[PDB]
Amino acid sequence: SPSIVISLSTGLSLFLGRFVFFNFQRENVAKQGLPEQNGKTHFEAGDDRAKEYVSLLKSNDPIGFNIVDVLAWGSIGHIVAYYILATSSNGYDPSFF
Amino acid sequence: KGEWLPGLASPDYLTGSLAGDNGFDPLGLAEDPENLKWFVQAELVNGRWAMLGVAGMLLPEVFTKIGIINVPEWYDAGKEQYFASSSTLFVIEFILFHYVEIRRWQDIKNPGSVNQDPIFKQYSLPKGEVGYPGGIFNPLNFAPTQEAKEKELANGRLAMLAFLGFVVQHNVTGKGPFENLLQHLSDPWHNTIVQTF
Amino acid sequence: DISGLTPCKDSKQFAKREKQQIKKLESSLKLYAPESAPALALNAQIEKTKRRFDNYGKYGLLCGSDGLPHLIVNGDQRHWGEFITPGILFLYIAGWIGWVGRSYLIAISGEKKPAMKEIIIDVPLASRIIFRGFIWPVAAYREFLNGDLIAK
Amino acid sequence: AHWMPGEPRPAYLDGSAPGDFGFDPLGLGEVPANLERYKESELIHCRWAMLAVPGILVPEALGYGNWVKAQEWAALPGGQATYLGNPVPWGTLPTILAIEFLAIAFVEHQRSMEKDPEKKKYPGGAFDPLGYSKDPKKLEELKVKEIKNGRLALLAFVGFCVQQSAYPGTGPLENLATHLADPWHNNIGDIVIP
Numbered sequence: 088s089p090s091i092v093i094s095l096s097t098g099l100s101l102f103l104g105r106f107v108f109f110n111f112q113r114e115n116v117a118k119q120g121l122p123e124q125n126g127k128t129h130f131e132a133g134d135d136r137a138k139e140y141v142s143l144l145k146s147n148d149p150i151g152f153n154i155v156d157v158l159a160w161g162s163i164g165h166i167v168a169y170y171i172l173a174t175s176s177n178g179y180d181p182s183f184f
Numbered sequence: 185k186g187e188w189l190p191g192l193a194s195p196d197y198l199t200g201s202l203a204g205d206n207g208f209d210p211l212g213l214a215e216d217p218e219n220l221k222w223f224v225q226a227e228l229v230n231g232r233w234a235m236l237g238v239a240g241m242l243l244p245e246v247f248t249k250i251g252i253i254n255v256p257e258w259y260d261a262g263k264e265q266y267f268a269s270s271s272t273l274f275v276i277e278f279i280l281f282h283y284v285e286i287r288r289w290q291d292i293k294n295p296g297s298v299n300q301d302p303i304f305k306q307y308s309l310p311k312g313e314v315g316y317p318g319g320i321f322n323p324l325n326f327a328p329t330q331e332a333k334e335k336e337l338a339n340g341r342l343a344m345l346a347f348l349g350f351v352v353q354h355n356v357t358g359k360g361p362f363e364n365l366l367q368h369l370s371d372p373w374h375n376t377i378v379q380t381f
Numbered sequence: 382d383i384s385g386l387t388p389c390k391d392s393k394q395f396a397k398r399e400k401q402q403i404k405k406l407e408s409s410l411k412l413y414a415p416e417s418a419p420a421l422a423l424n425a426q427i428e429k430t431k432r433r434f435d436n437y438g439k440y441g442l443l444c445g446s447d448g449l450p451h452l453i454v455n456g457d458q459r460h461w462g463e464f465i466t467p468g469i470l471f472l473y474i475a476g477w478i479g480w481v482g483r484s485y486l487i488a489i490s491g492e493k494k495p496a497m498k499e500i501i502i503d504v505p506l507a508s509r510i511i512f513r514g515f516i517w518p519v520a521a522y523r524e525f526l527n528g529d530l531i532a533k
Numbered sequence: 534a535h536w537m538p539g540e541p542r543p544a545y546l547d548g549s550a551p552g553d554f555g556f557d558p559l560g561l562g563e564v565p566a567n568l569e570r571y572k573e574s575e576l577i578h579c580r581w582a583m584l585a586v587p588g589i590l591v592p593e594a595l596g597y598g599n600w601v602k603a604q605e606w607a608a609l610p611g612g613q614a615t616y617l618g619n620p621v622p623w624g625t626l627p628t629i630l631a632i633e634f635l636a637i638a639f640v641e642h643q644r645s646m647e648k649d650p651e652k653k654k655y656p657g658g659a660f661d662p663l664g665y666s667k668d669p670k671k672l673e674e675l676k677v678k679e680i681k682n683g684r685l686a687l688l689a690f691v692g693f694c695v696q697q698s699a700y701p702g703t704g705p706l707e708n709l710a711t712h713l714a715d716p717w718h719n720n721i722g723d724i725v726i727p
C-alpha cells in the first residue's frame with residue numbers, strides 16, 4: 088500500500104530530523120555562516136535580494152523546528168519511500184549478484 | 185701488503201689494515217668508507233656461501249665416481265622427488281632466512297645491539313668485530329687471528345671463481361665438472377675450450 | 382594464441398610471401414648466364430631469404446592475418462626476447478654512456494676554465510673514466526643511498 | 534620492549550600509552566589530534582573484530598554451513614532468513630536493512646556526541662556493570678590485554694578473508710581440517726607458486 092509506506096517513511100524521517108540530528112545540523116550550519124564576498128555578506132555588499140528571511144524561520148516550537156526543516160526532511164522521506172515503492176514494483180532478480 | 189700488479193701504486197684509501205688487502209681496485213668502487221664496509225661484509229657473505237656451494241656440487245660427484253654412494257648430479261638434483269613438495273621447503277627456507285638475515289642486518293646497522301638472546305635472557309654473545317660473531321658461532325674456540333682471516337678470504341675467492349667456472353662450463357658443455365676434468369685429462373691437447381667450436 | 386594470432390610456422394600467408402619473393406628473385410635471375418657473377422649474387426640472395434624465413438619460423442613469432450610477424454610487449458614469458466631483453470640491454474648501455482659523461486663533467490669541473498677542456502677534450506682522463514661505466518648500476522645505487530646524486 | 538631491537542624509537546611514542554611498542558615506520562601520527570583519532574579508531578576496530586571472530590567461528594562447528602553462505606539468502610528473490618535452524622517470521626531484506634540502519638545510526642550518533650577525549654575510548658559507568666575498572670592498578674594491565682587481543686583478532690579476520698579468497702566457498706574450520714589431513718602438501722606454497 089503506497090499510503091502506508093509513504094506515511095511511515097515521512098514520519099521516520101521527520102522523527103530522525105527533529106530528535107536525533109537537530110544539534111549536529113545546527114552546529115554545522117553555525118560553523119559555516121552566510122556566504123561572503125570580499126569579507127562581507129552578500130546583503131552587506133549592497134544586494135537587497137540576498138536578505139535573510141528572518142520572519143519566515145521564526146517558530147513557536149520549543150526546540151526551534153521551522154518550515155524549512157520540515158520541507159527538507161519530508162522531501163528526503165518521500166524520495167526514500169518512492170525509491171522503495173519503485174524498486175519493489177518490478178521483478179528484477181540479480182541471479183547471484 | 186702485497187701488490188696485485190707490480191709497477192702499479194696501490195690506491196690511497198686501501199692502507200692494508202683490512203685482511204686480504206692487495207690494492208686491487210682499478211674501477212674505484214671503494215672510494216667511500218661506508219661503501220668499503222658494506223662491500224667487505226658483502227664479500228664475506230658472498231664466498232662464505234660459495235665455499236659451501238662448491239663443496240656440495242663437487243664432493244658428491246667424486247664420491248659417486250669412486251663408486252660408494254649413487255647420488256644425482258647437481259643440475260638434476262631438483263627433479264628428484266622428496267618427502268615434501270618444493271613449495272613447502274621454499275616457504276620454510278624463506279621464513280627462517282628472513283629471520284636470520286634481518287638479525288644480521290640489525291647487527292650491521294647497530295653493532296653490538298642484537299647480541300642478547302630474545303628468549304633466554306641469561307645468554308648473550310661476547311663483544312667482537314662485525315662479521316665475526318664468535319661465541320656460540322665459534323664452539324671450538326679458535327683464535328680469530330689475521331692469518332686465519334686471510335686464509336678464509338683467499339679460499340672464499342677461489343670458491344667463487346670455481347662456482348663461476350662450474351656454471352659456465354656446464355652451460356657450454358652438457359656434462360658435469362668431474363667428467364669434464366677427466367675428459368680433459370684423457371687427452372690434454374685435444375680437449376681444451378679452443379678445441380670445441 | 383594471443384589476441385587471435387596464429388603461430389608463424391602454421392600460417393599459410395607466410396609461405397605464400399616466401400614463394401612470391403623467391404619467384405620475383407628468380408625472374409631477374411633467369412636473365413644472366415649461369416657462370417656470371419650476378420647469378421651467384423642472386424643465388425646468395427635466395428639462400429639468405431630462405432634462411433631468414435626458416436629462422437623466423439623457428440623463433441616462434443606470431444604472424445597475423447596478413448601474414449607478417451607481430452610483437453608482444455605485454456611481458457608474457459613466452460615473448461620476453463622480443464622486447465624485454467633488448468630493453469634491458471639498451472638501458473644498460475644508456476646508463477653506461479650517461480654515467481661516463483657525468484663523471485667526465487664532474488672531473489673537469491675542478492679546473493679554472495672547463496670550457497677549454499670541453500671544446501678540446503683530453504684523452505688520458507677520458508680513457509681512465511670510460512672503463513668505470515662497466516659497474517655503473519652499483520655506483521649509482523650507492524651514490525643515491527649516500528646522497529651524492531642530487532645537488533643541493 | 535621495542536618492535537625491533539636496535540631501531541630507535543620515535544619522539545612522540547615513549548611507552549606511556551597501553552600497547553606502546555614504538556611501531557610507526559611511516560610516521561602517520563606526528564600530529565597529536567591524528568594520534569588521538571587513530572587511537573580511538575584502533576580501539577573501535579579491535580573491539581569489533583573481537584566480537585566478530587566468535588560469530589564466524591561458532592557456526593561451521595555445528596551443522597550450519599559458514600559465514601559466507603549465511604549471507605546468500607538475500608540475493609535470491611523472496612528469500613527468508615533462519616536462525617539456529619528455525620525460520621524467522623520477519624526475515625526479509627527491506628525491513629531488516631531499515632531496522633539495522635536506524636538502530637546502528639542512532640547508537641553511533643549517541644556515541645559520537647561525547648566530548649571528553651578520555652571517555653571516547655573508555656566511557657565506563659553504565660557500560661561496565663561488574664566494576665572491574667574501579668581499581669587503578671589492574672586497569673593498565675586490562676587495557677594492555679585488550680589491545681593485544683584486539684590486534685590478534687584483526688590479524689585473524691585478515692587471515693579469514695585471505696583464506697576465503699584463496700578457497701572460494703570454504704570455511705576456516707574446514708581449511709584447518711584440510712591442513713591437518715596432510716600437513717606437508719596442503720600449505721600456502723602451492724597457492725603462492727602455481
Ligand code: CLA
Pocket residue numbers: 479480481482483485502507510
Ligand atoms: C653528458 C651527458 C648528458 C646527460 C647525462 C644528460 C642528461 C639528461 N638530459 Mg641532456 N643533453 C645533452 C647531454 C646530456 N644530457 C646534450 C649534448 C644535449 C644537446 C643535444 C642535451 C639536451 C637535452 C634536452 C633537450 C633534454 C635533456 C634532458 C635530459 C634529462 C633526461 C634524459 C633524457 O631525456 O635524455 C635526452 C637526451 C638527448 C636529447 C641527447 C643527449 C645524448 C647526447 C647525444 C650524448 C651526450 C654524451 C656526451 C657527448 C659524452 C661526453 C663524455 C666523454 C668526453 C667522456 C637528463 C638530466 C631532457 C629533460 O630536460 O629532462 C628533465 C630534455 O628535455 N637533455
Ligand SMILES: CC(/C=C/C=C(C)/C=C/[C@@]12O[C@]1(C)C[C@@H](O)CC2(C)C)=C\C=C\C=C(C)\C=C\C=C(C)\C=C\[C@@]12O[C@]1(C)C[C@@H](O)CC2(C)C
Pocket residue numbers: 208209210211212213230231233234236237238240241257258259261262344345347348516
Ligand atoms: C655465492 C655463490 C654461489 C653459491 C652457490 C650455491 C648456494 C649453490 C647451491 C647448490 O649447489 C648446491 C650446494 C647443491 C645443488 O644441488 C643445488 C644448488 C642450489 C645449485 C657464488 C658467488 C660468486 C661470485 C663471483 C664469481 C664474483 C666475482 C667478482 C669479481 C670478479 C669482481 C671483480 C671486481 O670487483 C673487483 C674485485 C674490484 C673492482 O675494482 C673490479 C671488478 C672486476 C669489478
Ligand SMILES: CC1=C(/C=C/C(C)=C/C=C/C(C)=C/C=C/C=C(C)/C=C/C=C(C)/C=C/C2=C(C)CCCC2(C)C)C(C)(C)CCC1
Pocket residue numbers: 097157158159160161162163165166169
Ligand atoms: C501540527 C503539529 C504536529 C504535527 C506535525 C506534522 C504531522 C507534520 C507533518 C509534516 C509533513 C507530513 C510534511 C511533508 C513534507 C513533504 C515533502 C516536502 C515532499 C516532497 C516530495 C518530493 C520532493 C517528491 C519528489 C518526486 C516527485 C515529484 C516525482 C517522483 C520522484 C520524486 C519522489 C523525487 C505535532 C503533533 C507533531 C506537534 C504539534 C503541532
Ligand SMILES: CCCCCCCCCCCCO[C@@H]1O[C@H](CO)[C@@H](O[C@H]2O[C@H](CO)[C@@H](O)[C@H](O)[C@H]2O)[C@H](O)[C@H]1O
Pocket residue numbers: 135136
Ligand atoms: C530566461 C531565463 C531567466 C528568466 C528570468 C525572468 C525574470 C523576470 C523578472 C520579472 C520581475 C520580477 O519582479 C520584480 O521583482 C523585483 C525584486 O526582485 C522588484 O523590485 C525591483 O524594483 C523595485 C522598485 O523599483 C526596487 O526597489 C527593487 O530593488 C528591484 O529589485 C520588482 O518591482 C518586480 O517587478
